Amino acid sequence: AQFHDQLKARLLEHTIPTQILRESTLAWRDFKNTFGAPIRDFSKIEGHLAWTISTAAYYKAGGKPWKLGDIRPGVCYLGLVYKKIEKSKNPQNACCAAQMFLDNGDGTVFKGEVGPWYNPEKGEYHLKPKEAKALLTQALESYKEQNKSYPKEVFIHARTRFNDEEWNAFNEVTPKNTNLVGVTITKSKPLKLYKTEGAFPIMRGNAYIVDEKKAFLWTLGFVPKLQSTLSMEVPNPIFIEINKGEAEIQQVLKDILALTKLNYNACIYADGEPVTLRFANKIGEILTASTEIKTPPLAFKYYI
Amino acid sequence: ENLSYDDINIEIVRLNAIDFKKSWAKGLQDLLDAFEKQNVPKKHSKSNLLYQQIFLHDKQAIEKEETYDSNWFPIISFPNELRFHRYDWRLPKQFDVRTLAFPAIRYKEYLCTFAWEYDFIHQLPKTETYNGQESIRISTSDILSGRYDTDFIRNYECQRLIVQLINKAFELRMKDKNVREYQMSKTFAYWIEKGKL
Amino acid sequence: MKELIYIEEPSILFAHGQKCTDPRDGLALFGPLNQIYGIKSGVVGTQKGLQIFKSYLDKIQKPIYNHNNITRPMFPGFEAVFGCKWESQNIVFKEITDEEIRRYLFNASTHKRTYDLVTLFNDKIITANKNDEERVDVWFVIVPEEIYK
Amino acid sequence: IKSKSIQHSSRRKQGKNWWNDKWREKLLAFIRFLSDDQNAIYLNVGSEEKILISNKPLKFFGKMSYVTPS
RNA sequence: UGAGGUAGUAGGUUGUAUA
DNA sequence: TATACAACCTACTACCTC
Ligand SMILES: [Mg+2]
Known part of the structure; x- marks a missing residue:
């Protein structure tokens, strides 16, 4: 992993789109495995490889393959991901975000709020008041610059919970008529819904509501169109909780699914987790390997 | 979709029209169905796969009822009351509450040995205690919200204690059965042997 | 018996304002949303890497099945799907000689060798970027087999 | 087996052929094997008290499903 | 790193209660 | 400050491709 992240970090400093391809991927028949059998054989999926590579190359050259249409107009989706930076100074925890919103022409704006805001504790996957204020102000100013108006709602989601200090700072920053909603998306709680009769698993999109603030969503499983499964061995659901906010549990799940339908790095039906968090994790993985970039580019072409 | 049915020109409004307004794929599928119905002539798997793709462009789910099993095995009953015994000076400080027959914790400032029942004899046989000082709490209020919280133990801790007791009780029970143990990273696994069954 | 609610699958837009749920099918029928006119590629790697890349790029210009x-x-083909010209003939090449990789890869610390290769x-990429006239929209790094390990 | 790698490389090998049915029946049979009573399992939390776990897991149902492939 | 998923392993933090 | 738990967090290797 050292090669890829360092290369992307320096080219980030120089702002050049790039794509790394192994020789085994493009020519898999030549590189055998000492037994007359390819180490990685693409014989039955030779068109999926082409789909993925072509879509990635098209996106990295400045072209939109598709866009989201069914998303609430007037909201911002922010995903916060924490990565542990522990090399010299202290086991610091960097926070990297990603922003998505849609308005003024039905277009989709999918960028990443960057400028990692650190926290000098071993644990403590949270933000101090000043860094939270800076994060929210930067996101709000970006949205207002794009849309010439302030957001009607803000949809903050992360893999960790929010504390009262952070939420009070956020509410201090927020304008008079902007509401904030916090959501925590855990991934591996031990629930497994088997199907009583068939040998095929539960369908994707089934949701179980345990409370007016918590629910399970099956983002994997058996999809009718493809007549196959998006996973293996009894797919695992994800857990959604409305932490520190006031909203409905159905709109949240619909928004979560819509966010899952935005993976540009690969050509698939959908992925289990929302992409706003995966791309933030990629941004963090790229940034933590470099040495103190002042103002990184916010475009996704340079990172992925 | 902006053309009203009352404004279509004459000699077309009386015909059978195909709706391309909502989605073009559905209209094209309807067109192909009409063509195949009225024997419309047509002429290397680039068209068979294409036709299958057009047909399966929307394999919508059906309103069929299904029943799913889970792995959440419920608990049908609990012991009536949760007990809190003193056992001061009858329990050595350098003696863990584990390695004991029944699930017991030494939590809280005093009133240790959180077990549901008595009879820790032959392991600490002081066998001389005054039952008046023992504190007893109803498990009904502990599990189900209620006013079980006091300055002694608040409600949140009073449930994390019961979960601990259950997780311990399962471990001690699953040893008079006929299985052996495997040690995972943070838990224990219970598997049946080859000779049995 | 608890009841499970159902959430309808979202729809993603494509060209002509049309909708679908599977991006592959939607791109195949309708196509992309914007018009870039072509992809001018640039390859960094050994000559064998250039040959592999050219062979694959010529391969993906025609239908591929599963x-x-x-x-x-x-896969219908690149130009059929996207309407873009990405061809092997218009390729800018910057070569890494076998001597360079042999010298840098061998020995040294695990951090030092990675820093050297990067x-x-x-x-090469930056020097081509600032000291050349030909435009390169996206750069492709064809990593040899020994560099990975 | 006293190795932590050949067990991982065998778990990953063996789990690939098992699907919904082969996991569900095996889990239910294992749970039913331990049970003493026909409808519960006894955990002795004392000399006079016990905690009972039902032998039949929670069941869910939904109104939307799919037609199973052949 | 063309990708996605499943599982294992290793550590860490907070809130009690103790020595 | 260190050791016994429940509740939460991240970060690696190894193996699959339906
Ligand atoms: Mg990529």
Whole structure:
């Protein structure tokens, strides 16, 4: 992993789109495995490889393959991901975000709020008041610059919970008529819904509501169109909780699914987790390997 | 979709029209169905796969009822009351509450040995205690919200204690059965042997 | 018996303002949303890497099929799907000689060798970026087999 | 087996052929094997008290499903 | 790193209660 | 400050491709 992240970090400093391809991927028949059998054989999926590579190359050259249409107009989706930076100074925890919103022409704006805001504790996957204020102000100013108006709602989601200090700072920053909603998306709680009769698993999109603030969503499983499964061995659901906010549990799940339908790095039906968090994790993985970039580019072409 | 049915020109409004307004794929599928119905002539798997793709462009789910099993095995009953015994000076400080027959914790400032029942004899046989000082709490209020919280133990801790007791009780029970143990990273696994069954 | 609610699958837009749920099918029928006119590529790697890249790029210009064409939709071809010209003939090449990789890869610390390889590749890329006239929209790094391990 | 790698490389090998049915029946049979009573399992939390776990897991149902492939 | 998923392993933090 | 738990967090290797 050292090669890829360092290369992307320096080219980030120089702002050049790039794509790394192994020789085994493009020519898999030549590189055998000492037994007359390819180490990685693409014989039955030779068109999926082409789909993925072509879509990635098209996106990295400045072209939109598709866009989201069914998303609430007037909201911002922010995903916060924490990565542990522990090399010299202290086991610091960097926070990297990603922003998505849609308005003024039905277009989709999918960028990443960057400028990692650190926290000098071993644990403590949270933000101090000043860094939270800076994060929210930067996101709000970006949205207002794009849309010439302030957001009607803000949809903050992360893999960790929010504390009262952070939420009070956020509410201090927020304008008079902007509401904030916090959501925590855990991934591996031990629930497994088997199907009583068939040998095929539960369908994707089934949701179980345990409370007016918590629910399970099956983002994997058996999809009718493809007549196959998006996973293996009894797919695992994800857990959604409305932490520190006031909203409905159905709109949240619909928004979560819509966010899952935005993976540009690969050509698939959908992925289990929302992409706003995966791309933030990629941004963090790229940034933590470099040495103190002042103002990184916010475009996704340079990172992925 | 902006053309009203009352404004279509004459000699077309009386015909059978195909709706391309909502989605073009559905209209094209309807067109192909009409063509195949009225024997419309047509002429290397680039068209068979294409036709299958057009047909399966929307394999919508059906309103069929299904029943799913889970792995959440419920608990049908609990012991009536949760007990809190003193056992001061009858329990050595350098003696863990584990390695004991029944699930017991030494939590809280005093009133240790959180077990549901008595009879820790032959392991600490002081066998001389005054039952008046023992504190007893109803498990009904502990599990189900209620006013079980006091300055002694608040409600949140009073449930994390019961979960601990259950997780311990399962471990001690699953040893008079006929299985052996495997040690995972943070838990224990219970598997049946080859000779049995 | 608890009841499970159902959430309808979202729809993603494509060209002509049309909608679908599977990006492959939607791109195949309708196509992309914007018009870039072509992709001018640039390759960094050994000559064998250039040959592999050119062979693959020529391969992907024509239809490619899978085993199950319903589970995984086929590939019509690059220009048919995207309407863009990405061809092997218009390729800018920057070569890494075998001597360079042999010298830098062998020995040294695990951090030092990685820093050396990254420095070599990125020096080539940056020097081509600022000291050349030909435009390169996206750069492709064809990593040899020994560099990975 | 006293190795932590050949067990991982065998778990990953063996789990690939098992699907919904082969996991569900095996889990239910294992749970039913331990049970003493026909409808519960006894955990002795004392000399006079016990905690009972039902032998039949929670069941869910939904109104939207799919037609199973052949 | 063309990708996605499943599982294992290793550590860490907070809130009690103790020595 | 260190050791016994429940509740939460991240970060690696190894193996699959339906
Ligand atoms: Mg990529």
